[PDB]
Amino acid sequence: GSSGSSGPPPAPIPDLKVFEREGVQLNLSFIRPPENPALLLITITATNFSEGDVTHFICQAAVPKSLQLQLQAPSGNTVPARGGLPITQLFRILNPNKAPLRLKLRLTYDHFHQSVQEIFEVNNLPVESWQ
């Protein structure tokens, strides 16, 4: 029939701020699937509110040999400046070596008919991720 489980609620991981712009806003989400504990599915949420619709957005990353990285198919190289739907990209990472490393986030796009290049490294990652 139908049966849940016996036990208290776990402790998930709250979003993480990596990039904040007067118009653009990027958020980081960590997912830890039960089937694969050593697997870390990271997600990105780039929102645009400014009066300049973004296009041809490029999202890249970098990880140390120890870990792995998988670039999944995007959703669209276009972001609505009218609070529409942001872009999301899936990235698989293997941390079986039990080594809590960091992740690099490379951003490259065009805004207001101008070149927008900003690179940063998320060093304020949560402990639960590896722990």
From Swiss-Prot:
Subunit structure: May interact with AP1S1/Sigma1A-adaptin and AP1S2/Sigma1B-adaptin. Probably does not interact with APB1. Interacts (via GAE domain) with RABEP1, NECAP1, CLINT1 and AFTPH/aftiphilin. (Microbial infection) Interacts with HBV major surface antigen L. Interacts with HBV core protein C in a ubiquitin-dependent manner.
Membrane spanning residue stretches: none
Tissue specificity: Expressed in all but one (skeletal muscle) tissues examined.
Domain GAE: 11-126
Family the entry assigns: Belongs to the adaptor complexes large subunit family.
Residue numbers of the full-length protein present here: 662 to 785 of 785
Subcellular localization, as worded in the UniProt entry: Golgi apparatus membrane; Cytoplasmic vesicle membrane; Endosome membrane
Function: May function in protein sorting in late endosomes or multivesucular bodies (MVBs).
The protein's name: AP-1 complex subunit gamma-like 2
